[PDB]
Amino acid sequence: LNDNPIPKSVPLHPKSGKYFHNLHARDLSNIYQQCYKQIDETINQLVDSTSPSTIGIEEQVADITSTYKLLSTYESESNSFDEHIKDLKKNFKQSSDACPQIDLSTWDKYRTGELTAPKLSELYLNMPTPEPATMVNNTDTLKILKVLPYIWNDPTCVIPDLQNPADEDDLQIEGGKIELTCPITCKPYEAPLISRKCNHVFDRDGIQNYLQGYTTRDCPQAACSQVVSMRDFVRDPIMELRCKIAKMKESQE
């Protein structure tokens, strides 16, 4: 049926192609990145400001971690939607490459009814749900949060099996048997670092003194006491968070 006099299908003119190329989604990632940075900093300062004397911190940590999950899901949806829109633009431009020319015959054919060049309406009206899979769990902020629970009982002791990622959020954090003093400087480590292979804990000064000069060194603990390179060491805030929590607990009394 004729319906609207203009044909439902029409080839795309290069002038229209210019504007189509000009299309681009708003860079909401520019705002989401700083939203993530500011929520991270607010969380870190909140946990720093927590008073050990206060009891009943489980609900607040649960609420903030749920908020973190919610905002992470919202931000990943931004990535899914923009990649979907890029795919839709690619499909539209490749379909428009085979479009016929513009003339009276084409106008008559496409106004009388001919499914030759479909519109981009259905491309987004009934687009498949993004359904972002492989939920991000390697983010450092996610690991940092949810560590406060089960820490007041014995901060200085860390369960050896904490490295297990079996837990959906954070890890299996509970009491264990570990020393809070650097095995090198024989004093508490106010500037610690954690390895990415052996996952040990040291002091920045202690490790820099036990490794500098010796391009490759070993690890004091068992199963890793063999020459290794400094490149297997990285920085994780968790050790500093534990140290400051212990300092606050001690200074409370």
């Binding site: 029409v10 795309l12 299309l23 905002l71 829109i85």
Partner: protein, 256 residues
């Protein structure tokens, strides 16, 4: 021997019917008039159809312009609401920064102590409000992008219809050229160069006796069509074939 010329005098005089040239000219003019009339009808029909298509096309152009205007207004509105959402996000971030600054200030001053807990209650609620309101910015992003990509195909259609309008302009220029062709066809069928006059003269030279000869010649021309080729060739060749008579009817007259 003079009997040959006496007999062939009638054959020579028979060429007077060649008359034939007015008849072939009449049929040529009739077919030319028919061709011109059908050309005029075709051109007029084409112009009528193209104009009755353009006028709806002009209405479509106007409605597409209105749609473009109203969709650009909506495009400005979506950007305005996105900007206001971003401003609200910035305002709540500033509130968070101010409350954190106050928290650290009063903690430094402390070094009753419930002044810390009272603001710790407020900061968590503000963080939750920020998280909830982030939904408002997320929805503004999606709505904004979908709206722009949708009103874009409509303006693409508008420009395509503008190109079609240009093609219609070319087609109506062709129609104007066909109208000039109609005018020159009229100037050709003028028949002022001795045709309306030549025929009305020859077909009435003798209103008795000769009306029959030309009617018979016309009927013969319809039963058997002898084009201008016959007129030019045979009318002269019937006497030029032998071409040895001296057209001396006087010699034939003195025989008797």
């Amino acid at each position: 021997d003079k009997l040959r010329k006496s007999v062939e005098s009638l054959r020579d005089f028979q060429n007077k019917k060649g008359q034939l040239l007015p008849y072939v000219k009449v049929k040529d003019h009739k077919e030319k008039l028919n061709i011109y009339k059908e050309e005029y009808e075709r051109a007029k029909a084409n112009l009528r159809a193209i104009l009755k298509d353009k006028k709806p096309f002009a209405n479509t152009k106007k409605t597409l312009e209105n749609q473009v205007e109203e969709l650009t207004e909506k495009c400005s509105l979506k950007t305005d609401e996105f900007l206001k959402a971003k401003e609200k996000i910035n305002e709540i971030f500033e509130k968070l920064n101010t409350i954190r600054d106050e928290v650290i200030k009063k903690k430094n001053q402390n070094e009753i102590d419930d002044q810390i807990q009272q603001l710790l209650l407020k900061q968590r609620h503000l963080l939750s409000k920020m998280a909830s309101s982030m939904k408002s910015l997320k929805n503004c992003q999606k709505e904004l992008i979908s709206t722009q990509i949708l009103q874009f195909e409509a303006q693409n259609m508008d420009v395509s219809m503008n190109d079609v309008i240009g093609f219609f302009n070319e087609r109506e220029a062709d129609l104007k050229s066909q109208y000039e062709d109609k005018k020159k066809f009229v100037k050709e069928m003028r028949d002022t160069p001795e045709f309306q006059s030549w025929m009305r003269e020859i077909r009435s030279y003798d209103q008795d006796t000769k009306e029959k000869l030309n009617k018979v010649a016309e009927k013969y021309e319809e039963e058997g069509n002898f084009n201008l080729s016959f007129v030019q060739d045979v009318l002269d060749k019937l006497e030029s074939e032998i071409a040895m008579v001296n057209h001396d009817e006087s010699a034939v007259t003195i025989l008797d």
